[PDB]
């Protein structure tokens, strides 16, 4: 209403990654804008790239079903999900071996949904029993435990300053959690239905959240409320994943119509319209530089848009 | 460069390995076992072993495949079936000791109502329709004993049938297709799995050969 409209922006495909047969659930992009890891369904830890367009590692796993893949900021450790509560941690740089395991993470009752690497030592997992606790490879046990959601959580989101993370369960609400003390600091509500994925602002002042109610909103940490709402009349489906831009100016949200929609910051206008997906999109990844955005659907098509 | 040139050969080798793994996994039928609470979850896997999900393997007449037991998992069905999209055969192990127990303190009804609700939610699903659900009847001896000691029509006032062993074992099949809406692309198989003999596995293993062809014909499109 006051901000100058950016206008209609055209999005084109930069590259298409082919050579995988399993379903692509998670697409975690590294902090170096060079490599990215994706998840499979037959226990194949696959790592892709944008410019070179060549996979670098693939190792069979004990757990066939993989829900997520976490890529370390330094590119040293990697961990996959799983429904059998087996969060096997793997490393790339190994002597006399390609990929090996040293520590085994166990002790969860609910199914693991997503995993995020806070740093090279402490990692956080999202289980299906409302235990989004933090773990360590050295001690093999959890340090702090986060609880307070009436339902199980299925998504996580870290912060650039590496000090706290926001977590939102299926209770149509999101809560912030500190790594030091380990308890909810603020609760945000206003979604009509459950959420699927959450994303954090690069600056750290707010965070966006997409739900199945065909609505989007960004909760402010200082104002303790959302600024604007992204309603939709001709959309009956929901949002499976949400992400920000390099600095948080552009909004990205994948819908169930085998495409994605690019929303503005305050104008709430569909500037970019996506297409070309044969199956339902699962998760998309935005690089730190904000140049290209890779999307992951169920048709084993890792298309990069730029 | 030399590294960029060797990367092509490395990609070719890793793609050949991935294709070999996919071809090896494409000949293994994926069975998905589920059931009610303690509805014979361990007595069924302890049969073919001599001749938090669970992974089991057993080869019969030169046909190796993997089988996934759901195990103990207390979660919703909206986010749990997304991982299990595309399973060819879902084996439901219904319980025969849930209609006699009293109503639970947390559940609004008894365990049999929860069992039929879970069956309805796993059958009348919009995600997977081309797949198939088989039903395994376990613990038949104790069921016949408790149905000869206590009647069965006292809890089911919908019908006025007799209290025998064959009629009770035959009426429980037709009561499962009334809840299904799509029948032209969905089918339900029911077999008898005795707990006293081990030679019954081959009585249902060939039954798998009946359903797999179905999804094979799903690639034909002539149906």
């Amino acid at each position, epitope marked *: 209403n006051n901000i100058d409209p950016v206008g209609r922006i055209q999005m084109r495909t930069r590259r298409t990654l082919r050579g995988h047969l399993a379903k692509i659930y998670a697409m975690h992009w590294g902090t170096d804008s060079r490599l990215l890891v994706s998840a499979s369904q037959d226990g194949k830890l696959i790592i892709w790239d944008s410019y070179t367009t060549n996979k670098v590692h693939a190792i069979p796993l004990r757990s066939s079903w993989v829900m997520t893949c976490a890529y370390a900021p330094s590119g040293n450790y990697v961990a996959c999900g799983g429904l059998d509560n087996i969060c096997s941690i793997y490393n790339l740089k190994t002597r*006399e071996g*390609n990929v090996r395991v040293s520590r085994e993470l166990a002790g969860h009752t609910g199914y693991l949904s997503c995993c995020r690497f806070l740093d090279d030592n402490q990692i956080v997992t999202s289980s299906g029993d409302t235990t989004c606790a933090l773990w360590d490879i050295e001690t093999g046990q959890q340090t702090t435990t986060f609880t307070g959601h009436t339902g199980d959580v299925m998504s996580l989101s870290l912060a650039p300053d590496t000090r706290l993370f926001v977590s939102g369960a299926c209770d149509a609400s999101a809560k912030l959690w500190d790594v030091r003390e380990g308890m909810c600091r603020q609760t945000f509500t206003g979604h009509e239905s459950d959420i699927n994925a959450i994303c954090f602002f690069p600056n750290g002042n707010a965070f966006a959240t997409g739900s199945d109610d065909a609505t989007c909103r960004l909760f402010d940490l200082r104002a303790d409320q959302e600024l604007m709402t992204y309603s939709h009349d001709n959309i009956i489906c929901g949002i499976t994943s949400v992400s920000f831009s390099k600095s948080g100016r552009l909004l990205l949200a994948g819908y169930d119509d085998f495409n994605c929609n690019v929303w503005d910051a305050l104008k709430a206008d569909r500037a970019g319209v996506l297409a070309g997906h044969d199956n339902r999109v699962s998760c998309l990844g935005v690089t730190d530089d904000g140049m290209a955005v890779a999307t992951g659907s169920w048709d084993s098509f890792l298309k990069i848009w730029n | 460069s030399a590294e960029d040139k060797a990367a092509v*050969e490395r990609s070719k*080798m890793i793609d050949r390995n991935l294709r070999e793994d996919g071809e090896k996994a494409a000949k293994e039928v994926k069975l998905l076992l589920l059931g009610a609470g303690e509805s014979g979850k361990n007595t069924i896997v302890k049969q073919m072993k001599i001749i938090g999900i669970v992974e089991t393997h057993f080869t019969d007449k030169d046909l190796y495949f993997k089988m996934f037991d759901v195990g103990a998992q207390r979660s919703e069905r909206k986010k749990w079936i997304h991982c299990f999209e595309g399973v060819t055969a879902i084996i439901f192990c219904v319980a025969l000791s849930d209609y006699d127990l009293v109503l639970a303190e947390d559940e609004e009804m008894n365990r049999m109502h929860a069992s039929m609700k879970l069956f309805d939610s796993i059958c009348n699903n919009k995600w997977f329709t081309e797949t198939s659900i088989i039903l395994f009847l376990n613990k038949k001896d104790l069921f016949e004993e408790k149905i000869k000691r206590s009647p069965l029509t006292i809890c089911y006032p919908e019908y006025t049938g007799s209290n025998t062993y064959e009629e009770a074992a035959a009426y429980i099949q037709c009561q499962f297709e009334d809840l299904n809406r799509r029948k032209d692309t969905k089918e339900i198989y029911t077999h008898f799995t005795c707990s006293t003999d081990t030679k019954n596995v081959q009585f249902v293993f060939d039954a798998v050969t009946d359903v797999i062809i179905k999804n094979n014909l799903k690639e034909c499109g002539l149906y």
Partner: single-chain antibody
Amino acid sequence: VQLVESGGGLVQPGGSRKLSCSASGFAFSSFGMHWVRQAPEKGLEWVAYISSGSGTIYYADTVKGRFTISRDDPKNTLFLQMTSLRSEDTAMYYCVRSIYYYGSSPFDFWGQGTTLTVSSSDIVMTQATSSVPVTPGESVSISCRSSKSLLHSNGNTYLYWFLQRPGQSPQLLIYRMSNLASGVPDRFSGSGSGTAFTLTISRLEAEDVGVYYCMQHLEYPLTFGAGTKLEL
């Protein structure tokens, strides 16, 4: 984790000799293997290298057509057949394990090799210095020249730095001249233009008298050259 080499003894010019290398503890079908050799007179020279899984094979311009290599994945035993060898190729062979991927650090663990004494198009890289007595801890800066134009799409230097340490094999410590490998601390720095390279060495520790070796990573016949040596 180990690479033992056997097959030493005496050989006559014009005969045959068996050179084998037993290596275990890693995926033999997921690593590269080089056949670089070191002579007591000249520096390093590349003779052969085959891709993983018995893929592509290449040779030099003076060896292709005389020697033949082999490979064995199950038994993990190497082979090397000599056919009409001369007396001017005497050296001490090696058995190097390598790996090639994006951001990789190859040439980690090499072999020790046995002494093989014998009785009686191509690009060439130039060096800068041969031997200069420099005291330890004087901010030594080794320079390197080139006669080729580097205009690759990635934008990095295709060159590795080797150090012949008396006692073991010259393992690789500085790769791409801009990153640090495993086993060495972060204390070096590489700069320069696309033709000249300036590598600085700060705060040298004790017993650093080994000779350096420069190479290129854009062509199969790895041109090593003489190399730069230091003194006490």
